[PDB]
Design a protein around this motif. Structure first.
Motif, PDB file in Angstrom:
ATOM      1  N   UNK A 224       2.737   8.490  -9.504  1.00 53.05           N
ATOM      2  CA  UNK A 224       1.862   7.652  -8.695  1.00 53.05           C
ATOM      3  C   UNK A 224       1.849   6.189  -9.130  1.00 53.05           C
ATOM      4  N   UNK A 225       2.202   5.927 -10.386  1.00 51.60           N
ATOM      5  CA  UNK A 225       2.217   4.553 -10.883  1.00 51.60           C
ATOM      6  C   UNK A 225       3.354   3.726 -10.280  1.00 51.60           C
ATOM      7  N   UNK A 228       2.835   3.333  -6.586  1.00 48.56           N
ATOM      8  CA  UNK A 228       1.818   2.332  -6.321  1.00 48.56           C
ATOM      9  C   UNK A 228       2.282   0.906  -6.519  1.00 48.56           C
ATOM     10  N   UNK A 229       2.984   0.667  -7.621  1.00 47.66           N
ATOM     11  CA  UNK A 229       3.489  -0.659  -7.931  1.00 47.66           C
ATOM     12  C   UNK A 229       4.472  -1.111  -6.847  1.00 47.66           C
ATOM     13  N   UNK A 231       4.520  -0.442  -3.680  1.00 47.47           N
ATOM     14  CA  UNK A 231       3.758  -0.863  -2.524  1.00 47.47           C
ATOM     15  C   UNK A 231       3.142  -2.249  -2.699  1.00 47.47           C
ATOM     16  N   UNK A 232       2.497  -2.519  -3.836  1.00 48.24           N
ATOM     17  CA  UNK A 232       1.883  -3.840  -4.014  1.00 48.24           C
ATOM     18  C   UNK A 232       2.931  -4.948  -4.112  1.00 48.24           C
ATOM     19  N   UNK A 235       3.914  -5.742  -0.619  1.00 46.52           N
ATOM     20  CA  UNK A 235       2.864  -6.558  -0.014  1.00 46.52           C
ATOM     21  C   UNK A 235       2.970  -8.028  -0.404  1.00 46.52           C
ATOM     22  N   UNK A 236       3.111  -8.297  -1.699  1.00 45.63           N
ATOM     23  CA  UNK A 236       3.226  -9.665  -2.171  1.00 45.63           C
ATOM     24  C   UNK A 236       4.473 -10.322  -1.608  1.00 45.63           C
ATOM     25  N   UNK A 239       3.799 -10.984   2.168  1.00 46.98           N
ATOM     26  CA  UNK A 239       2.789 -12.012   2.415  1.00 46.98           C
ATOM     27  C   UNK A 239       3.239 -13.431   2.084  1.00 46.98           C
TER      28      UNK A 239
ATOM     29  N   UNK B 163      -4.137  -6.676  -4.249  1.00 50.37           N
ATOM     30  CA  UNK B 163      -3.824  -7.348  -2.987  1.00 50.37           C
ATOM     31  C   UNK B 163      -5.078  -7.479  -2.114  1.00 50.37           C
ATOM     32  N   UNK B 165      -5.979  -6.992   0.736  1.00 53.87           N
ATOM     33  CA  UNK B 165      -5.824  -6.248   1.971  1.00 53.87           C
ATOM     34  C   UNK B 165      -7.130  -5.527   2.248  1.00 53.87           C
ATOM     35  N   UNK B 169      -5.878  -3.081  -1.998  1.00 52.97           N
ATOM     36  CA  UNK B 169      -4.869  -2.192  -2.565  1.00 52.97           C
ATOM     37  C   UNK B 169      -4.619  -2.757  -3.960  1.00 52.97           C
ATOM     38  N   UNK B 171      -3.260  -1.756  -8.264  1.00 50.82           N
ATOM     39  CA  UNK B 171      -2.768  -0.847  -9.289  1.00 50.82           C
ATOM     40  C   UNK B 171      -3.349  -1.375 -10.582  1.00 50.82           C
ATOM     41  N   UNK B 302      -3.058   5.401  -0.815  1.00 52.33           N
ATOM     42  CA  UNK B 302      -2.615   4.122  -1.344  1.00 52.33           C
ATOM     43  C   UNK B 302      -3.350   3.825  -2.651  1.00 52.33           C
ATOM     44  N   UNK B 303      -2.698   3.112  -3.580  1.00 54.27           N
ATOM     45  CA  UNK B 303      -3.350   2.796  -4.855  1.00 54.27           C
ATOM     46  C   UNK B 303      -4.606   1.932  -4.710  1.00 54.27           C
TER      47      UNK B 303
END
Lengths: 332, 333
Positions: A224-225, A228-229, A231-232, A235-236, A239, B163, B165, B169, B171, B302-303
C-alpha cells in the motif's frame, strides 16, 4: 556480447538515422543510451532501445520537436515537451531547474506532453555532478494495479533523489518493487526474483519475471505504500504541469506518450560550508558501510554507488550486452 | 476506554503542567496530541505521549524553547529548533514553508536541533488544507539496519506527501514496512502483521510485532529501496539544515533528539486553474476507485482517504483509547 562504448553508440546512431532522426540529434540521443548502459543501467539503457525505436517509428516521439516554456513564475516553470525525445528533453529540463536553483536556491520544472525519459537517474546524477541535490519523477501509462486491485490503473512513476556526495549517492526507484525493465533483466539472466514481484493468474505472490510481465499484476514496493506514493506523485506531476495523468494517457493515447515529469534542483553550498558538507556526508556513509554485515561475503553498499564502480568496470573490461538484446538491435 | 475530546486533552494537559510546561504551551501541545488522536492516529497520537513525557524529563525537550531563523534565502530558510517541542515547532515550520510558497511559488524550511514531530502527516495535512502540495520528512536515531547489514545504522525517516485534493490524498510512510508505533498498535489490538515486519532474532522474516520490537530488526519497506531512500532523506535533512544526521544523533546523543527535519510547500493555483484542477484530480481518483478489485467486497482506497470517516466517527461517537495506554498516562500523575 562484449562491446565497446564506441560500438554501442554507433549501433544506436545508425538505427536512429535510418529512422529519419536528425544528425546531431541522433548522436545526442545515442550518447545518452550508451552512457546509461556503460554506467550500469541496462534496464533503461540498451535493453530499452528497441522499444524506444518502436515508439519513435509509431510517431509517439517527434524527432525534431523541442521543449517550449509555457509559464514562468520565478523558481517555478511549466514547460511543454511537445512530444519530443524523452531523454534529450529531460536532460535539458533538469538543466533548467539547476539554472533556476542557481538563482533562487531551488528550481522546479514541470513538464507536460513528454515522452519516456529512459533513466530518471540520469537527471538526478547530472544535478549532483553540479553540486546540487537532484529530485525528479515521472508518471506513465497504467502498468500497475493500485493496492487492492487486479487491474492496472496506476503507474510505476520512478522517483529519483541524488546527493552531491563522494561518490554520488542516489536512489532511482520504480514504485513497483521491480520495474518492468528489471523484471526483464532477471529473465534475460535466467533467474528468479529475490523477493516477491507480483501475483500470478489471480493467485498468490510470485517470483517469476515472465508471469508478472504477462498479466501485469506487478507488486507495488511496500504494498500500500508504493501504491500510495505512485498516486500522489502522479497528482503532483499532473497538477504542476497541468498535463496528462496516468488515467489521461492510458485513456486518451494509443501508447505511453504525452506523460508528465517533475525536475527539481536544490542548492546546497549556501546553506552549509563545503568542508563541513563533505565531512557530515562522510560520517553518514561510513556509519552505513561499517555496519554489521548480514553476510560476511557481501559488503554493504550505499544507494547508487554501483553507478561509479560498474562504470569503472565497464570502461576497463568493456560492456557486456545481452546477446538477445544485441541481436535485436542488429536486426534493426 | 471511551473518552471525549476535552477529556483526552485534559489528561495530556495535566501531565505537561506537572513537568514544568507553561500553561499556554501545555494547552497547545495537549491540543495537538488530542487532535492527532481524534483524527485516527494513535501510534503517534495518544500512544506516544508517555514516551514524549519521559524524553521531556530527561531534558531532551526544552518546553519554553522556540524556533529561530538562522538564514533566509528567499524560497529556502534554515531554522534552529533549539530543542523545542517537536510537534508544536513542526507545525510552525510547515506554516512558514507555506507562507514562503505563497510568494515564491515554493517554500523549504530546513530545521536542525529538533525533537520528534509525532505525526508527520499533520504537517502534510496543514499544507493540503491551505491549497498547497505538502512534502516533509525527518531523520531519527539509528533504529533500522541498512540493506546488507544487521546492525541498526539508519533511521525510519518518515516521508510525507499531501495533495490539496478533495478529499485530501496523503501518504505518511515510515521507511520501515511498519513504524514502531504501528507495531505497538497491532500488539495492543492483539493480532499479526499483514506482511513481513522484520527479521526475527538470529532468524528470517516474521510477522510477530513483539519479536520485531525486541531485536529492532525492523524490515525496511521495499528492502533495498526503503533502506536507500532512508539514507538520501537523512543526507538532505542533514545538509540543508547543517544539522545532525542519524549517525550524529545516535553517536552523540543519549536518546532521539537534536533531529533534522524538512518542510516543503508547493503552490498549485498559479500553475493550473481551479475547475481544471478539480477535474483532473477527480479523473485520477476515480480511475483508482473504479479499478477491478482482487476482492469484489474490498473497495480500492486512496491513501489518506480514511481520515474523513475516522474523524467523523470520533467526533460523534467519541474517542476510543487503549485501556493500558490510558492507564499508563494517568499513572504519570
Amino acid at each position: 556480447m562484449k562491446v565497446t562504448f564506441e560500438q554501442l553508440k554507433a549501433a544506436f546512431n545508425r538505427v536512429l538515422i535510418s529512422r529519419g532522426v536528425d544528425s546531431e540529434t541522433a548522436d545526442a540521443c545515442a550518447e545518452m543510451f550508451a552512457r546509461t548502459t556503460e554506467s550500469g543501467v541496462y534496464s533503461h539503457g540498451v535493453n530499452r532501445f528497441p522499444r524506444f525505436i518502436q515508439q519513435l517509428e509509431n510517431g509517439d516521439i517527434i524527432p525534431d520537436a523541442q521543449p517550449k516554456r509555457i509559464t514562468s513564475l520565478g523558481a517555478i516553470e511549466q514547460w511543454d515537451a511537445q512530444r519530443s525525445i524523452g531523454n534529450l528533453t529531460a536532460k535539458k529540463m533538469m538543466d533548467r531547474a539547476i539554472e533556476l536553483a542557481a538563482d533562487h536556491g531551488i528550481g522546479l520544472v514541470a513538464l507536460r506532453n513528454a515522452n519516456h525519459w529512459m533513466r530518471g537517474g540520469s537527471y538526478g546524477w547530472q544535478a549532483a555532478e553540479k553540486g546540487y541535490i537532484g529530485i525528479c519523477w515521472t508518471n506513465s501509462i497504467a502498468v500497475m494495479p493500485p493496492w487492492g486491485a487486479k487491474e492496472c490503473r496506476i503507474g510505476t512513476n520512478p522517483l529519483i533523489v541524488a546527493i552531491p556526495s563522494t561518490p554520488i549517492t542516489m536512489v532511482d526507484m520504480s514504485m513497483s518493487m521491480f520495474s518492468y525493465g528489471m523484471l526483464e533483466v532477471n529473465r534475460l539472466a535466467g533467474r528468479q526474483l529475490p523477493v516477491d514481484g507480483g501475483f500470478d493468474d489471480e493467485g498468490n505472490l510470485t517470483k517469476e519475471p515472465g508471469v508478472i510481465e504477462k498479466n501485469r499484476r506487478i507488486l507495488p514496493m511496500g504494498y500500500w505504500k508504493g501504491s500510495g506514493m505512485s498516486i500522489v506523485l502522479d497528482m503532483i506531476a499532473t497538477l504542476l504541469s497541468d498535463g496528462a495523468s496516468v488515467a489521461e494517457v492510458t485513456q486518451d493515447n494509443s501508447d505511453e506518450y504525452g506523460i508528465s515529469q517533475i525536475f527539481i534542483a536544490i542548492e546546497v553550498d549556501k546553506l552549509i560550508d563545503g568542508p563541513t558538507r563533505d565531512a557530515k556526508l562522510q560520517r553518514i556513509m561510513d556509519y552505513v558501510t561499517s555496519a554489521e554485515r548480514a553476510d560476511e561475503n557481501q559488503a554493504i553498499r550505499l544507494p547508487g554507488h554501483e553507478f561509479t564502480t560498474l562504470l569503472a568496470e565497464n570502461r576497463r573490461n568493456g560492456i557486456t550486452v545481452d546477446d538477445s538484446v544485441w541481436a535485436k538491435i542488429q536486426a534493426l
